[PDB]
Design a protein around this ligand. Structure first.
Ligand SMILES: Nc1ncnc2c1ncn2[C@@H]1O[C@H](COP(=O)(O)OP(=O)(O)OP(O)(O)=S)[C@@H](O)[C@H]1O
Ligand SMILES: Nc1ncnc2c1ncn2[C@@H]1O[C@H](COP(=O)(O)OP(=O)(O)OP(O)(O)=S)[C@@H](O)[C@H]1O
Ligand SMILES: Nc1ncnc2c1ncn2[C@@H]1O[C@H](COP(=O)(O)OP(=O)(O)O)[C@@H](O)[C@H]1O
Lengths: 680, 24, 675, 61
C-alpha cells in the first residue's frame, strides 16, 4: 500500500508509545479541534516560531486520540505524517514520484477523511517543490483542497505564511491562522519535569529540579534564538552527555599511569634503583583506584538498569490502564513502584556514600558550566562601584551619585514606567563624560557599542524631531530609520547621550518629556519603542563657567544646588525635575591629567614594545606635559595633541633617524621646553 | 543511458526609485 | 489533459450539490450574463475587496446554469476555474510556464466554444516573467475564450490600467458589499447547512446578533465571510462541548481513586461511598447517552429535511406534478414541527449544555478572536470612579455622549467639540484619559497635539500635511496619520491660544465636515472621534472668583473673555466650554491619596506591607502643592520625597517584606518603621 | 553498508549543501537516514550556508 510506503503514522507510534508525552496546551488543542470539525475553512496551520512543540502539538493530539480524549468524530481517525524526501527516494522520471503521490491521494480517497494527515511547512511545500517535466505536492494536492479528502494540519512561521500562503485565494480560504503563543517559564518547567525521566533513562544520570528551574531562568535570560522548550531541552541533554563524559573519565588515573610508565622507562633503562619499590607503591595505588572506579561504574550500572525497570513498569501499568487487566493494576502499582523507588534511593544513597570521583545529579553549577561553554544585584552593585574608578579617574561625588541612581534603578521600587536613565551631567569638556557613558555601558550593558551618540547641538533648527525621530518623508533619515528612535529600534539595550542641551528647541524638551514619562515614544512611522531598558544622559555647559571658576574652595552639594538653579534659569523647571539626578563634573586638575597622560604613555610603550622599544618618562617631563596639555576650557584634547607633537615628533624623528637602539632604557629627559630621549 | 541536458535559467534584477523634496 | 491538471468543474460540484446555494446579487449576475453573451470583449472582471464572495457569485451563476435560468447561448456550457499561481510556480527555466499556458489554450480550443473560464488574481497574471497576458491576448480578443476576472479595485488601478489589451480584453462588472439585512437572509439560507454539518441547532436572534457584533467589533473582515467564521467556530465550539464530560471525568477519577484506596485497605465505608459515586456516575453517563441519542435523531431528521428540500428542487427542475405538492405540503411542515419538538425537548434535556448557539458564544468567539447603553446610563458614575470633582463637566460630557450614541444631532458633525479652560494640573488630561477609557477603550489610546508650538504658515503645513513635492510629505500631517491609524480615539489640543488663527479654519472644517482633506489627497474622517481643545485663558479669573460663584455666570464671564480672545465663528461652533475650576485642597489631597494607592500597589508589586500616618499624608499634600500649576508639582514632589529616602533605606538593608511599615513623620519629612 | 556498520563508523561530510544536492540526488536520498537517526554524521560549514541552506529547511532543524 502507498500508505505503507512513505507515511509516518503518529497514532501508531503513540500506540507504541514512541512519541513523547506532551504536556499542557489544552486551550490550543481545543481551539485546534474547533478548527478541525468545521464545515468550511477546514485545514489548520500552526503559526509560530521554529522550535516550539508545534510538531508536539500534533503528536499530543494523536496521544489524546490513543487515550480517547477527543470527541467522537475524531475517534477512529488516523493521524499520519507524510515525508517529502521519502517519496523522492527512488523516483526522478516523468511522473513516478507524482504517480506515488497521486496513489497516496487515491488512498486518501479510499479512506474519505478517515486519515487526518499532517505536513508542516506548507509554504515550503508550495514554493520549493521544483520538478522537471513533473509537478509538486502543492499543485497536486491543491485539488484535495477543493475535494474535501484533505483535513490536513500545517505549521509555519509568521512571515512565510504571509509570503507564500496568504497571497493565493484557495490557499487562503482552505486555511486558518491558528496562532500559537509563546509559552511561559513554569509550563516549560512542568514539561521538563514530565520528560526528565526519559532523559535520565537515555543518559544514565539524575537531574536536579532546582537545576531545572535555574536552567529555565538562565535560558530565558541569556539564550536568544532558541526557544521553548528547545533551549531547556538542549541544556538538559547536553549537560547529561557532559556528565556522561565525566562518567567515562577519571584524571588521577592518567596522572598515575603517566607516572608509572615514566618510572618504568627509567627502571628499564637502569637495568641503586629504589624505583621497583616506588613502582610497586604507585601500581598498587593505581590498581586500588581502578577497582574503585569499576565498582562505582557497576553501582551506576545497576542503578540505571533498575531506573529503566521503574520506567518500564510505568509503561506497563499505563498499558494496563489502556487495556484493563484486573490484578495487573494493583499488582504492578503496590508491588513494583514503592520497592523500586526505595531501592533506587538506596542505590542513590549508596552512590552518595561512594561518589568520590564521579557525579550523576546534574546540578545548577553544571548548567552554569554548560552555559559558560555555551549573582546579579549586590555583585553588580559592588563591582559597578569598583569599575567606576578604573577608566574614569576621580569624580568620586559623581561616582557615588550615579551609584545611588543605578541602585534605585535596579531596585525597581521607583516608577518602573519611567526609563532607567535620566541624567544631566554638568561640567566642562574633556572630562570623562563620554568615558563615563562608555564605562556605564561597560558594566551595566557590559560592552562598548551599547550606546548611541547624538548631540543636541545640531538640533537648534526647527526640524529636530523630524530628522531625529522620524517624519513624513521627503527626508534622508527615513529609509535609514532615523537618528535616535530607530537606532533604539536597532539597539533596544543601549545608553543615550544628549550633548549640548543648551542648543535646544521646543521640539526637544517635549520629546524628552515623553521619554521621561513614558519610555515608549511616538515616532513618525507610528511604532513606539520603549526606553525602559536604556539609559538617557544629557550634558551641558551653562553653569560650567561657574564649575570651571569656583570648584576650588567650594563644596559639591551647594554647588549642585546653585547650578541646578542656573539650569532652572535656562530651562523650564518642569523639564528638569523628571530627571533622576543632575550632577557636576569638576575640572580635572593635576593627578587626573598625570594618570591619563600616563595611560597614553603606557599604550605608547605598548606599541613600541610591538616595535621592540623600552622607554621611561621623567616626571619633570610629566609636569611640563601637565602644563602644556591642560587648558581651563577643553582639557584632554590639548593634552592629546601636546603628547602627539612634543613626544611623537622628536621620537619618530629620531627612530627613523636610526639613532636609537632597541633594548636600551630610553629615558625621556627634559629639554628646556621639550623632551629628549637618551640611550643608556 | 542519458545525458545531463543543458538548461535555460531565466534570471532577473530590479531598480530603486528616488523622490526629491523642495526646500521652500 | 491540462483541464484535469489545472481546472475545477464547479458545475460538477454544484451538480452534486457541493456548493453554496448563493443568495441575492441578481443584478450583477445578470450584467455578467450580459457581458458573457457579447460578440467581442467577452470577458467580465469582478472588482471588489476579497471576502465579498465574487467566487461565490460565479458559483451561484453556475448553480443557475444547473437550474438552467440562462439565455440561449449558455445552455450546455461548462464553467471551469483556474489559478495563475498553479502556472507560475513551475518555472524553472525559460518556456515551462508557457507550454502549460498554450496547452491550456489547446484544450480550450479543443472543447470548441463550450467552456466558460474563470481566473481570479488577475493582477497576479500581470507579472510572471512577455509572460502571461500576451499569450492570452488572441483568445481574449477573438471571442475564443470567455474569461471571468476577480480582483480588487486597488490592484485594478495599479495593474490593469497599464496594458491596454489587459484593459479592453476585459470588462468591468462592479461588485458591491452586502448589506445588513441581506446578510441576515443569506445566513437564513445558510442556517440549515450549518445545522446539518455541526449536528446542532442555531438561535436565529443570535444570528442577527452575530451580524450586529460582526459589524460592531470587527474592522477587517466583512460579509458574508466574518459571520460565516463566527457561526462556524461557535458551532464547532458547541459541538465540542456536546461531544465530550467534565463531571463524568471528576466522578471517574474519584471512583478509580477510591477503588485503589479500597484495594489497599483490604472500618471500610468505601464500598458504600464507591457504590454511591458509581451510581451517580452511571446516572450522568445514561443522561449523556440519552442526550446524544436525542441529538442523533434530531440531526438525522434535519438531514432528511434537507434531502427533502433537495428532492423538491430536483422536482422543480424535472417537473413532477404530484411530487411537488406531496413533498411540500406533507414533508415540510411535519418535519419542521417535530424538529421544533426536538428543539424544545433538547432545551429540556441538555443540562450538563445546549445545542442552540447563543450570542454569548458569539461574544466568546469575538472577544477571544453587552452593557454599553446601560453603562452610558451610569456614565457619570464611571467618570467619577476615577476623577474627583468637576461634576458639571462630567454631566455635560455625558450629555454629549448620550446625544451621540442616541444620535440626535447632525451625524456628519463630530462627536466631541469642547474647548477647555482654567489652570491645569487638576486632572484635565486625567479626565481625557479616563474619558477615553470608560467611554471607549483606554487612557492613552488617544492623540495629543502640542498646539503651543504651531505659530506660523509652515507650522500649519506641518500639522495639516505638506503639499506633494515638498518637505514633509509621505506620512501625512502630524494629525493625519494620528487619526487615520486611530479610527476611534480622542483628539487633544493643548494651548489653542498660542496658535496662529489660521488653524482655527482647519478646526472649522473639522466641525462642519468631519472629513478633512490633507496634503495627501485623502480625507481622514473625525466623525467617530472626539475633539478636545484645551487652554488656560481664564485661569486666574476662576482662581480669584471660584469662591461662592456659580457655574453658569462664571462660564459666561470667561466665555466673554474668550470672545475677547477668539473668533466669533469659532465660539459659534463650540458645543460647550466647561469651567475646570480649581477643586480644593482636600480633593487634590485625595488625588494625592490615589497616587499613594497606585504607589502602594507598586509596593505590593514589590511585595511590601506599608502604611502611613495621615499627618504624613497632609505634609505630603502640603509639599509640592501650588494653585499656579495644579497637582503635578505636588505629584512629582511627593514622588521624589518618597522614592528617594524610602528606597534609600530599602537599599540600606532595613525594610523587610512582611513587617509593619508605618510611614511616620519626621519633623518635616517621613520615615518608615520596621515592626 | 553504513546501516550494517551499526554505530561503529562516524561520518563526517562538510560543505553540507553538497549533501543537500550532488548532481533527488543526495538530499532526498540521505535525508531519510538523517530524519531517522540511523545516521551519526558530523557537519561543518561556513555561516553562509547556515543561513541559506540550513535554516531555510526547518525540516532539518
Ligand atoms: N578625570 C579624568 N580621568 C581620566 N581621563 C580624564 C579625566 N579628565 C579628563 N580625561 C581625559 O581627557 C581627554 C579628553 O578627551 P574627551 O573624553 O573627548 O574629553 P572629555 O572626557 O570627554 O569631556 P567632553 O564631554 O568630551 S567635553 C580624554 O583622554 C579623557 O579620558
Ligand atoms: N450572495 C451570496 N449569498 C451567500 N453568501 C455569499 C454571497 N456573496 C458572498 N457570500 C459569502 O462570501 C464568502 C466569501 O468567500 P469568498 O468567495 O472566498 O470571498 P470572495 O468574495 O470570493 O473574495 P475572495 O477573493 O474569494 S476571499 C463566501 O463564503 C460566501 O458564503
Ligand atoms: N510542552 C512541550 N511538550 C512536548 N514537547 C515540547 C514542548 N515544548 C517544546 N517541545 C519540543 O520542541 C521541539 C520543537 O518543536 P517545534 O517547535 O514544532 O519545531 P519547529 O519550531 O522547528 O517547527 C519538539 O520536538 C518538541 O518535542
Amino acid at each position: 500500500q502507498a500508505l505503507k510506503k512513505y507515511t509516518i503514522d503518529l497514532t501508531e507510534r503513540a500506540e507504541q508509545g514512541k512519541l513523547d508525552p506532551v504536556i499542557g496546551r489544552d486551550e490550543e488543542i481545543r481551539r485546534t479541534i474547533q478548527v478541525l470539525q468545521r464545515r468550511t475553512k477546514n485545514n489548520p496551520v500552526l503559526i509560530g516560531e521554529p522550535g516550539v512543540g508545534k510538531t508536539a502539538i500534533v503528536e499530543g493530539l494523536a496521544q489524546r486520540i490513543i487515550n480517547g480524549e477527543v470527541p467522537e468524530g475524531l475517534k477512529g481517525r488516523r493521524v499520519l505524517a507524510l515525508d517529502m524526501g521519502a517519496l523522492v527516494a527512488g523516483a526522478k522520471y516523468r511522473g513516478e514520484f507524482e504517480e506515488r503521490l497521486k496513489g497516496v491521494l487515491n488512498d486518501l480517497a479510499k479512506q474519505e477523511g478517515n486519515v487526518i494527515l499532517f505536513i508542516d511547512a506548507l509554504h515550503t511545500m508550495v514554493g520549493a517543490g521544483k520538478a522537471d517535466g513533473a509537478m509538486d505536492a502543492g499543485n497536486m494536492l491543491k485539488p484535495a483542497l477543493a475535494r474535501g479528502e484533505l483535513h490536513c494540519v500545517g505549521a509555519t512561521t509568521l512571515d512565510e505564511y504571509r509570503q507564500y500562503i496568504e497571497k493565493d485565494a484557495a490557499l487562503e480560504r482552505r486555511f486558518q491562522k491558528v496562532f500559537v503563543a509563546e509559552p511561559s517559564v513554569e509550563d516549560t518547567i512542568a514539561i521538563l519535569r514530565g520528560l526528565k525521566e526519559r532523559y535520565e533513562l537515555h543518559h544514565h544520570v539524575q537531574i536536579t529540579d532546582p537545576a531545572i528551574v535555574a536552567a529555565a531562568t538562565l535560558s530565558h535570560r541569556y539564550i536568544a534564538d532558541r526557544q521553548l522548550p528547545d533551549k531547556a531541552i538542549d541544556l538538559i541533554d547536553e549537560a547529561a552527555s557532559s556528565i556522561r563524559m565525566q562518567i567515562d573519565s577519571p584524571e588521577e588515573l592518567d596522572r598515575l599511569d603517566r607516572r608509572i610508565i615514566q618510572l618504568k622507562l627509567e627502571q628499564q633503562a637502569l637495568m641503586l634503583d629504589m624505583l621497583n619499590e616506588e613502582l610497586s607503591d604507585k601500581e598498587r595505588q593505581y590498581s586500588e583506584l581502578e577497582e574503585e572506579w569499576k565498582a562505582e561504574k557497576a553501582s551506576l550500572s545497576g542503578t540505571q538498569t533498575i531506573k529503566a525497570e521503574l520506567e518500564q513498569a510505568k509503561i506497563a501499568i499505563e498499558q494496563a490502564r489502556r487495556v484493563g487487566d484486573l490484578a495487573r493494576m494493583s499488582e504492578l502499582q503496590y508491588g513494583k513502584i514503592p520497592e523500586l523507588e526505595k531501592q533506587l534511593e538506596a542505590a542513590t544513597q549508596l552512590e552518595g556514600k561512594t561518589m568520590r570521583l564521579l557525579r550523576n545529579k546534574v546540578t545548577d553549577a553544571e548548567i552554569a558550566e554548560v552555559l559558560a561553554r555555551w549573582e546579579s544585584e549586590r555583585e553588580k552593585l559592588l563591582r559597578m562601584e569598583q569599575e567606576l574608578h578604573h577608566r574614569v579617574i576621580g569624580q568620586n561625588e559623581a561616582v557615588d551619585a550615579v551609584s545611588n541612581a543605578i541602585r534605585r534603578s535596579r531596585a525597581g521600587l521607583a516608577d518602573p514606567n519611567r526609563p532607567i536613565g535620566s541624567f544631566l551631567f554638568l561640567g566642562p569638556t574633556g572630562v570623562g563624560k563620554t568615558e563615563l557613558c562608555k564605562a556605564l555601558a561597560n558594566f551595566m550593558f557590559d560592552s562598548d557599542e551599547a550606546m548611541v551618540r547624538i548631540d543636541m547641538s545640531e538640533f537648534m533648527e526647527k526640524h529636530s524631531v523630524s530628522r531625529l525621530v522620524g517624519a513624513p518623508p521627503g527626508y534622508v533619515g527615513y529609509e535609514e530609520g532615523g537618528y535616535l528612535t530607530e537606532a533604539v529600534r536597532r539597539r533596544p539595550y543601549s545608553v543615550i547621550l544628549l550633548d549640548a542641551v543648551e542648543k535646544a528647541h521646543p521640539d526637544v524638551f517635549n520629546i524628552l518629556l515623553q521619554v521621561l514619562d513614558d519610555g515608549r515614544l511616538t515616532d513618525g512611522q507610528g511604532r513606539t519603542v520603549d526606553f525602559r531598558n536604556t539609559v538617557v544622559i544629557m550634558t551641558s555647559n551653562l553653569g560650567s563657567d561657574l564649575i570651571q571658576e569656583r570648584f576650588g574652595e567650594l563644596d559639591y552639594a551647594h554647588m549642585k544646588e546653585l547650578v541646578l538653579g542656573v539650569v532652572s534659569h535656562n530651562f523650564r523647571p518642569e523639564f528638569i525635575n523628571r530627571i533622576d539626578e543632575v550632577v557636576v563634573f569638576h575640572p580635572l586638575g593635576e593627578q587626573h591629567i598625570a594618570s591619563i597622560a600616563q595611560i597614553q604613555l603606557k599604550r605608547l610603550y605598548k606599541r613600541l614594545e610591538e616595535r621592540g622599544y623600552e622607554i621611561h618618562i621623567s616626571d619633570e617631563a610629566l609636569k611640563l606635559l601637565s602644563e602644556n596639555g591642560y587648558d581651563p576650557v577643553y582639557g584632554a584634547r590639548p593634552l592629546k595633541r601636546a603628547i602627539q607633537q612634543q613626544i611623537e615628533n622628536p621620537l619618530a624623528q629620531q627612530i627613523l633617524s636610526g639613532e636609537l637602539v632597541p633594548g636600551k632604557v630610553i629615558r625621556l629627559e627634559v629639554n628646556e621646553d621639550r623632551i629628549v630621549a637618551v640611550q643608556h | 543511458a542519458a545525458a545531463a541536458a543543458a538548461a535555460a535559467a531565466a534570471a532577473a534584477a530590479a531598480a530603486a526609485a528616488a523622490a526629491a523634496a523642495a526646500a521652500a
